[PDB]
Design a protein around this ligand. Structure first.
Ligand SMILES: [Zn+2]
Ligand SMILES: [Zn+2]
Lengths: 147, 49, 147, 116, 269, 67
């Protein structure tokens, strides 16, 4: 426990945890999404995950940076459904643009005709801070550079 | 909201002027001496390239 | 008013490389009037289809029949009384890229890539049949199975 | 040593109000209700009773921490109908449903015992 | 925007177990009913133990822990007794607590089994559950030791104690839990695909199934909502299971009415 | 040392089902038939009787401190 306000301000302005995200050792983040959080990130951002209105409205209570404007569903008829990518897009703030590959991305898919439309949903692409393509993994939400 | 299939209004001479102004304003070693200028391009050679 | 595209499609190949997702089917389709090519990911459990089916597909920019744009945020009021009543499958997405001529090629062919919340469409064909398509434009899929 | 008393999960302290209503400023006709010393029971019933109302647009509860016995509901309704009135209507409908279930269960117990 | 119309059908009722089906109600209501049967249903259990002679082989708090877990017959009593915090009394009024006594001294060479039959009660309606067991004179089972064994004593050891039993619910402590396992199940044929079987042929069929032998899952119905719930409430002997269900619904109604009263109280601001 | 009053996961009263369990074991039964005859159908209560060891019978062999 610091015992003075100048030491308190030094803890605030230097030592605090969000200021210590990037290592100067290897210009990479030191903190990453780990364990079942990472496992359920991979299990949520799959293509087949369809989430009903009730579950989305429960899940949006845990996002304090939400602007209280509900996104329009991926499917409007007959039942309104959201996808896992459509609610991960709410988590990602600001203008964030990124292209990476999932760990099971085949090597011959990039030279094929299905480069920008993945049969296996393995080309991760985020445009304008909302997730568009791909299944996230350690390569996208880990300690690796350019994540 | 840049449309990449529509004609643009950016002349290349303004691109050259903006790049030159940006590289003149992106300094590391300050001063106007020969040593200071030479150390400035030696510090910013890879960034300028 | 607001209908960017409208055609009747025949399904000619369903999951050609194997079914990779449980609730998502991939349809390869060819049209009848305008010789288009379609790759579309649909919800398999919610709207099942078989090979050789015919379906009417309408790509619109709004559900309002007078052509005025929508509010952009979901409410569970206005999905009836509109152009979506005549269709059994309504989806919502946006274009993330348009391939084809780019800048240094002829405009004989054109491809448009749409991401409905993670589900993917590639619609390709003649460039004059894809007027009004642009990147980061939101759009509606309307889809009804024919007999 | 630091074990909290076991009766703090259901008993209010001195001067602790049960319901703390907070008006939302991001959108219109939205409220955040904070109920102390309760759990997922009341929150689950009230939310799934609120979602049967067509006049509500958003309804969701959250327990912010398992160690703090407290839960919140965000309710956003249309512009003719207060969220507090929606919370009244949900509680009243749950009470009516539970009373109907209680009398039906008493009738079923009576006929099962008398029928042999 | 209105309430449901819950219909109940009881498939089995006995002295310690009820099996019934809820029809046309939401899943939150059924899960909250299960939670209020486990946690917030009140019963009587021993809470105040004072020892005057503990010359046995077990400690004071171990014996207090073993005595406090003993279920007590509290069907006709718990709705009239108040909590200790809600009485004007201080020294444990009879409308606040139930007095129990025990005084066993072993003077024989064989092992003396101190059970719940030695736990005398000042109230004639609050007894341990073995009042249901001592009346079985048709004992072809072969063993008369049907009572909860509190402790064993050898010669020269004695146990004298005075205890007070209070009213409480299982949220405060698990000794006030009236049930012994509430089985709760909806959609036994997996017609809603709420859970995903990698191999549906590897799973045994539920007792409430409707499928024949060569089928393993019902066809998928995306329009289906959970409105049929199978409940099996088993009592631990403290309360009758129908009394467990009735008092659980009454506690839920009291909680909702208290929330309504507090909301209407804060509404005038 | 002694049999618990209640099952841990389950809450079913098992304090009256230890001497009967020992008598059924010594009569002629196996453990499974004894647990079925006692009525403990769930294995959560059957692990409370199969795994239990009675250390109070060893503690009772020692002479008491006070006569
Ligand atoms: Zn009292
Ligand atoms: Zn058990």
């Amino acid at each position: 426990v610091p015992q003075s306000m100048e030491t308190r301000a030094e803890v605030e302005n230097i030592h605090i945890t969000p200021r210590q995200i990037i290592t100067p050792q290897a210009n990479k983040p030191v903190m990453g999404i780990v364990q079942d959080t990472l496992t359920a990130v991979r299990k949520m951002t799959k293509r087949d995950v369809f989430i009903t209105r009730e579950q989305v409205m429960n899940l949006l209570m845990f996002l304090p940076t939400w602007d209280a404007k509900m996104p329009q569903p991926c499917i409007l008829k007959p039942r309104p459904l959201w996808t896992g990518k459509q609610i991960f897009s709410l988590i990602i703030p600001g203008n964030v643009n990124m292209i990476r590959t999932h760990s099971t991305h085949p090597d011959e898919e990039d030279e094929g005709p299905y480069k920008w439309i993945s049969p296996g949903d393995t080309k991760v692409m985020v445009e304008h801070g909302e997730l568009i393509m791909g299944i996230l993994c350690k390569k996208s939400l880990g300690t690796s550079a350019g994540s | 909201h840049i449309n990449k299939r529509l004609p643009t209004d950016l002349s290349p001479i303004r691109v050259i002027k903006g790049v030159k102004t940006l590289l003149e304003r992106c300094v590391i070693v300050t001063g106007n001496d020969r040593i200071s200028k030479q150390a400035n391009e030696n510090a910013t050679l890879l960034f300028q390239c | 008013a607001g209908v960017l595209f409208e055609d009747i499609f025949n399904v000619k190949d369903m999951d050609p490389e194997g079914k990779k997702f449980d609730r998502v089917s991939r349809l390869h389709c060819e049209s009848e009037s305008f010789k288009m090519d379609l790759i579309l990911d649909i919800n398999s459990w919610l709207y099942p289809m078989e090979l050789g089916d015919k379906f009417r597909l309408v790509l619109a920019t709004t559900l309002r029949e007078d052509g005025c744009p929508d509010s952009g945020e979901y409410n569970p009021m206005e999905h009836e009384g509109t152009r979506a009543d005549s269709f059994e499958y309504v989806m919502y997405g946006k274009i993330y890229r348009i391939e084809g001529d780019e800048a240094h090629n002829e405009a004989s062919r054109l491809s448009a890539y749409v991401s409905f919340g993670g589900l993917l469409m590639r619609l390709q064909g003649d460039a004059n049949n894809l007027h009004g398509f642009e990147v980061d434009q939101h759009m509606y899929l309307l889809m009804k199975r024919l007999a | 040593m630091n074990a909290p008393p076991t009766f703090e999960s259901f008993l209010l302290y001195e001067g602790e109000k049960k319901i703390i209503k907070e008006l939302d400023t991001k959108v219109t006709n939205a409220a955040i209700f904070t109920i102390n010393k309760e759990d997922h029971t009341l929150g689950n019933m009230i939310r799934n009773q609120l979602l049967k109302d067509p006049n509500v647009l958003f309804a969701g509860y959250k327990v912010p921490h398992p160690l703090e016995h407290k839960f919140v509901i965000r309710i956003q309704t249309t512009a003719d109908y207060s969220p507090q009135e929606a919370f009244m209507n949900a509680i009243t409908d749950l009470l009516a449903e539970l009373s109907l279930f209680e009398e039906r269960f008493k009738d079923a117990i009576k006929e099962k015992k008398e029928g042999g | 925007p209105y309430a449901n119309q819950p219909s109940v059908q009881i498939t089995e009722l006995t002295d310690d177990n009820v099996k019934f089906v809820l029809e046309d109600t939401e899943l939150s209501v059924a899960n909250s009913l299960r939670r209020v049967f486990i946690a917030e249903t009140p019963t009587l259990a021993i809470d105040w133990v004072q020892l005057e002679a503990n010359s046995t082989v077990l400690s004071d708090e171990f014996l207090a822990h073993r005595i406090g877990l003993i279920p007590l017959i509290s069907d006709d009593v718990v709705e009239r007794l108040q909590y200790t915090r809600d009485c004007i009394c201080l020294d444990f009024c009879p409308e606040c607590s139930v007095e129990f006594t025990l005084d066993v001294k072993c003077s024989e060479e064989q092992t003396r089994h101190v059970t719940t039959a030695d736990l005398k009660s000042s109230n004639a309606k609050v007894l341990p559950v073995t009042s249901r067991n001592q009346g079985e004179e048709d004992n072809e089972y072969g063993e008369s030791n049907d009572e909860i064994l509190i402790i064993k004593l050898r010669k020269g050891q004695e146990l004298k104690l005075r205890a007070y039993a209070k009213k409480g619910f299982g949220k405060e402590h698990a000794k006030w839990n009236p049930t012994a396992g509430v089985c709760f199940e909806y959609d036994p044929d997996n017609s809603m695909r709420h859970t995903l079987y990698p191999k549906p042929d590897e799973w045994p069929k539920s007792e409430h199934t409707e499928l024949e032998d060569d089928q393993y899952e019902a066809p998928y119905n995306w329009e289906a909502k959970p409105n049929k719930f199978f409940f099996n409430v088993e009592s631990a002997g403290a309360l009758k299971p129908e009394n467990i269900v009735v008092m659980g619904v009454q506690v839920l109604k009291n909680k909702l009415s208290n929330l309504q009263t507090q909301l209407s109280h804060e509404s005038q601001n | 040392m002694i049999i618990p009053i209640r099952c841990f996961t389950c809450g079913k009263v098992i304090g009256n089902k230890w001497e009967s369990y020992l008598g059924l074991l010594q009569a002629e039964y196996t453990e499974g038939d004894a647990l079925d005859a006692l009525g403990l159908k769930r294995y959560c209560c059957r692990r409370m009787l199969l795994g239990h060891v009675d250390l109070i019978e060893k503690l009772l062999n020692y002479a008491p401190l006070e006569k």
